[PDB]
Amino acid sequence: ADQLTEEQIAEFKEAFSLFDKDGDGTITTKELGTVMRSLGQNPTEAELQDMINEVDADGNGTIDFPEFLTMMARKMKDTDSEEEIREAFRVFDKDGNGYISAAELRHVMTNLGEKLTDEEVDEMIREADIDGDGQVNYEEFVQMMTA
Amino acid sequence: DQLTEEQIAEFKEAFSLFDKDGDGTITTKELGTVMRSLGQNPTEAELQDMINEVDADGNGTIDFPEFLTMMARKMKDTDSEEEIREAFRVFDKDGNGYISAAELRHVMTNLGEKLTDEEVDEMIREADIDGDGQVNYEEFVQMMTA
Amino acid sequence: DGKPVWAPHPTDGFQMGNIVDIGPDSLTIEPLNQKGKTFLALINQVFPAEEDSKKDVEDNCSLMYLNEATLLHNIKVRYSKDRIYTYVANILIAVNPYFDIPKIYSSEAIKSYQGKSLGTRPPHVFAIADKAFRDMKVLKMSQSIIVSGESGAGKTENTKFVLRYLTESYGTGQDIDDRIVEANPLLEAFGNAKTVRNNNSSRFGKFVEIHFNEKSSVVGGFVSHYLLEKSRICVQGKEERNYHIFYRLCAGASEDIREKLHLSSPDNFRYLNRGCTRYFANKETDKQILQNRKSPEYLKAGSMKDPLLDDHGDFIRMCTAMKKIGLDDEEKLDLFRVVAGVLHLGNIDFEEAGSTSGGCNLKNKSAQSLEYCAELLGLDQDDLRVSLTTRKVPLKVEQANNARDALAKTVYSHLFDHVVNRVNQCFPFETSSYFIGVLDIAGFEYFEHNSFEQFCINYCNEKLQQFFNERILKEEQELYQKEGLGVNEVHYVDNQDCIDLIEAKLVGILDILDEENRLPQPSDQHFTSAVHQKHKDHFRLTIPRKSKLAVHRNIRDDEGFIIRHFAGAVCYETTQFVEKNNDALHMSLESLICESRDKFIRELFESSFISVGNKFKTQLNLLLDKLRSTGASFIRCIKPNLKMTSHHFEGAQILSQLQCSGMVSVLDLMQGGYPSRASFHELYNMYKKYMPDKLARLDPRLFCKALFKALGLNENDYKFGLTKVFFRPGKFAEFDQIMKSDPDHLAELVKRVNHWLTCSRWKKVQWCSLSVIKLKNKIKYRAEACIKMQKTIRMWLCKRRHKPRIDGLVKVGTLKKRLDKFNEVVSVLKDGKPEMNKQIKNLEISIDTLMAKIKSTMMTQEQIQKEYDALVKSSEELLSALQKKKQQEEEAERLRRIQEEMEKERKRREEDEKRRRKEEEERRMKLEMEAKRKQEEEERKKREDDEKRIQAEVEAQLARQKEEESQQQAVLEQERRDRELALRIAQSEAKYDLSKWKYAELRDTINTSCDIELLAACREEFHRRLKVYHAWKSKNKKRNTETEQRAPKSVTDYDFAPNRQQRFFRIPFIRPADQYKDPQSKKKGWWYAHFDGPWIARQMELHPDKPPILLVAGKDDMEMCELNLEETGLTRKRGAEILPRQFEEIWERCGGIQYLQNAIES
Ligand SMILES: Nc1ncnc2c1ncn2[C@@H]1O[C@H](COP(=O)(O)OP(=O)(O)O)[C@@H](O)[C@H]1O
Ligand SMILES: [Ca+2]
Ligand SMILES: [Ca+2]
Ligand SMILES: [Ca+2]
Ligand SMILES: [Ca+2]
Ligand SMILES: [Mg+2]
């Protein structure tokens, strides 16, 4: 099951809207690098160039969005889906205590660059919390994700 | 461990042939490089690991019963040729049976444990890898493992 | 081999049938209803059918299949269930039922539709009126409900219902709302008559504008009239009546009224008795009318029945109506006096004097009528016959009767004008902001003999149909392209040529006829000739000798013409056009009448060629200017049958009207078009008044974006353009909901939009982190793929470098242990020892020499293979010498056994050797095969480069040819419309000739005949017909469904580019470089393909998560491609071509031999 659902595709469209800072529809290794190094990982220009040339139809260096979804495509493992979603949560959860505070969302929002006020992040947590205990857990993420 | 007797015969046979020291021992530095001689396929990590555990005694050389054990748990967990071909087809751009030789060269040199120029030249010339006619990776894979 | 479909039919229009055959341009359909009957039906006229016949949908754009046949069937099902009204995405088809359907026009029905968005209630005319009111309140611009349809379609009744709704739902209970509706019967009496096509036939086209104030409350009305048919008042047809007022007066006048107006039975007036004289009355009303009124012919034949009209009842009704609208008894008596004056003025018959001096005189019988007319119209007898007998140049009898009729026509025209003015002043208004104006023009009408009135009526129909075309097709496609939505543009039949024909200058018909009239010697023949001179090659106007109907063929060139209107072709006899053009009542009559003594006559007329045509052109231009200035909502009334019968629904007529009116093209456009349009900015500022400051920080399109999910709407509904936001058809209950201005509702939507937006601001970041993780793990994927890469590279480096020796010295060690084994038996034997010893030392010398040669240096596999090849024969010589020693030395028990087992082991060795040699040589020959194929495609690329073939000029002429073919297709459609209208008039009056072969035989003779050349053209035809059938299934596609992939998109979409080799191939359906870039996302996996000869033979598609779908020709060929190998371009694809037996391997692991056996059975 390499293909994705239409809803998954739309939410990735939102994600690319976050990569596509200027909104031109195209991105070259520079932005992938800036955001990805910002989000904890450390890549090298060589393999990002490799991936681009994997999904560069014209070899121009810029990546269209469908090529971006395609560059995600992979023969994954069935358990790999939950594995990567949990790695994502840990990316959101720096301490790895299973619950995101105001401060952790604060820091992640700062790193990705969306400018938020400290009341807005509290509102974010309170709106994402179906159980309403005051801080978010995992199945809460999933029910937010598919929603 | 248990295994076919004829394969032990070939193992003793290859161990005997390349005993440059002649004292019944194979020095590791050539041992691992020619240990690849059988269709078993170690990485650099696995060859490094067997060097470490053989040199764990500090000798720097091996003896044949050890080497038999070496190849025992070496063959115990080995990669399927189908998995190899899966890796080959990861880089296939258009699923057209060809990967362009430069993209291939880029893959081997640039990614992972670096592979040197001479090997890729052996590919291009000796391995029937036309630069104009991009390698038909099924053909390579076959000749590679068989 | 499918589902039943729709097919052409003469009477029911379109009929239900299954496809038996697939011809070149026809599908030979079997009408299931009349089994055995059969015909060929064109490609562009066979349509898909609905799964179940009993389903009826209120909005046709919500049908599964969108085309003319399904529209006609939807109407037919709804009509029999007493729901005559139907929708096409904003246009209401109102089929006239010809009987009062109950419980739908009562005030309780009017009570429901108030403010309901169309779609939330059953379709009804009140919903169009309420959509008009809603769009006038919201968009704040005037609107016009352009009711259009043929003569007898239900235009006046639908207009009455619109006015009743607009005045009973949105009045305030004054007298004005009542008057706006109760004015209609008065105008009905004074301007309607019995035509052949209708009993209450609107002979004047009215524009009732209900004016509204700023506060959206009714302020009054204003009723305009265009082109009161004036020829009737004087001459009437065989089965047609004059205007009702000449009859309602007679049949409804009281005793004193009868004495005053000097009435009698209608047969006693010349203006009436030339036509139908029978009143309309039911049994009770028939008994009600006094016997002295009824003409003898009415006794001889009897009253005719209409579901609504009744002459005496209508007179009482309009008496109450005049009293309500404020006409006192004096104004009433004045109107009836002028009517009776027109009636009498016909009876004055003019005789010629005995001498041939042009003496115009009157009979003795006209003497009483002379006095009566003088008294009624307030004139003097002396003045009257002086005015009529001469002009004082004496006249002739023909000119005298022309004069009488001229005075009558002028008087009745001004009487109608005065009635309309009094009605207008019944409900006055000074100023207003907007108007909702229904438009009930006299619809298209055609008759056996047509004169100027029919020509102008059809001309007005022409302009209004052109307006409909511009409003719903031209303007809408221009707007769509400005938004660039990529809707498949639909071509409409433009009527602009006919408008230009009628109304032009120095080339137009009306202006040429004005030129004719301004000549000192007018001539009908001259005008017809001039029109045939100035429009020699125009498409629209046709000399009647080139007609379809045989009736018009009699009229020769210089007396008439035939104009192909939108509705079809109508023959206009140019007899008496020149006289009917003129509005110049001579000074004699105008002088006669302005010095009438009655106050009413003077007030009538107080309000030199002057063409009626130019006046009407100005009137219609002004009306269209008002219409263009406003928006529009359309009603298309459809007449079911030409025989006035209820519960009778003839398909042919209704479908002719549907194609003529352009409703079919509107359906083909709204199949993908968006009826509901809206501006982003309107929504943005519409909500900014309540939507808070922070949420406004979004882009206006972003805030509109979050809006649509506060409603939880579907993404299959809208499609944001450049400066507009749209909605698909059948989604009005949500668009008007978005237009709601309820402050509590807006607060609720604000909260919902806020939550959806903060949800999206979560989702963006979370999915961004997932994208980061997925890229990181794609790095891991490629890194480990490359580490396996390197693993195999290194292993094969050390497999050609050492492993060849290892294998060779495995063989050598085998031989060495064998030598060890021999030496024992060598010792066993006892004769001829020395030569065995020489042999054994030679063999051990071979052994140790080769062991040194191997362990010392590097050697190739082939070298050691040669060395062992020699030593094999060396061991063979060992064995052979051992047999001879056996034959000359006796160790029987030892040697026999030992030697025979050496022989057996040697034979098993040799069997192995042959096996391995075959294996290796087959591998090599396989690349001798593959390499040749790769060189083949390279050489084909080189040949293509060397050819340098150019087709730019070919496609340059192909585009012009396609445009010309479209032109002839439009011409053929116009000819079909013309012949349909002609049929309607006729009904009203009363080396291998395989081109003929079937799809059937071809599939069978493809699968048996082995006569080479047969399958040349057989396969070729069968594939040509297959292309035609796939084309038919392509144009007639379910709109929610996507296209059908019988081959991968890459193969069929290489068509940008223009032998018995059993060429095999293999192509991904989606090229993995385009994995998630397929919006269809329908068929995935490997498209295997065997092409045998010039055409496909077998195929296969292993989906990732599905069982296989094998095919084969001469059997499943509907999912097998029809494209030729060259069009597939698989020779130009690199690595597609595949191994013969590799197909046949995944073939057999998927029921290959089994599906082949099934094909053999099939
Ligand atoms: N909704 C309706 N219900 C009942 N009868 C109708 C309806 N619409 C039209 N009719 C019938 O149509 C006839 C008059 O047609 P009309 O509307 O005057 O045609 P036109 O408007 O073309 O002159 C009447 O006899 C009336 O019974
Ligand atoms: Ca960018
Ligand atoms: Ca690009
Ligand atoms: Ca935490
Ligand atoms: Ca929680
Ligand atoms: Mg009418």
Numbering used by the authors:
A (entry chain B): 2 to 148
B (entry chain I): 3 to 148
C (entry chain A): 3 to 393, 408 to 623, 639 to 1021, 1074 to 1141, 1165 to 1268
Pull text from the paper:
Myosin VI is the only molecular motor that moves towards the minus end along actin filaments. Dysfunctions in myosin VI have been associated with various human diseases, such as auditory and vestibular defects, familial cardiomyopathy, and certain cancers. The multifunctionality of myosin VI requires its remarkable capacity to interact with a diverse array of cargo adapter proteins, such as endocytic adapters GIPC, clathrin light chain a (CLCa), Dab2, and TOM1, autophagy receptors NDP52, TAX1BP1, and Optineurin, as well as ubiquitin proteins, through the C-terminal cargo-binding domains (CBD1 and CBD2) of myosin VI.
Here, we determined the high-resolution cryo-electron microscopic structure of myosin VI in its autoinhibited state. By combinatorial usage of the three datasets, we determined the cryo-EM structure of autoinhibited myosin VI at an overall resolution of 3.54 Å. Notably, the EM density in the PB + ATP condition clearly indicates the presence of ADP-Pi at the active site. Considering that this condition promotes the highest level of autoinhibited state formation, our final model incorporates ADP-Pi at the active site. Our structure reveals that autoinhibited myosin VI adopts a compact, monomeric conformation via extensive interactions between the head and tail domains, orchestrated by an elongated single-α-helix region resembling a “spine”. In the autoinhibited structure, the monomeric myosin VI in complex with two CaM molecules forms a unique “head-to-tail” architecture, in which myosin VI ties its “head” with the “tail” through the interaction between the N-terminal SH3-like domain and CBD1. The conformation of the MD in the head region closely resembles the Pre-Power Stroke (PPS) state including the actin-binding site, the active site, and the converter, leading to the LA and the following LA extension (LAE) consisting of a three-helix bundle (3HB) extending to the opposite side of the head. A sharp U-turn between the LAE and SAH in the tail makes the head/tail interaction possible by bringing the CBD region near the head. Certain cargo adaptors such as GIPC can release multiple inhibitory interactions and promote motor activity, pointing to a cargo-mediated activation of the processive motor.
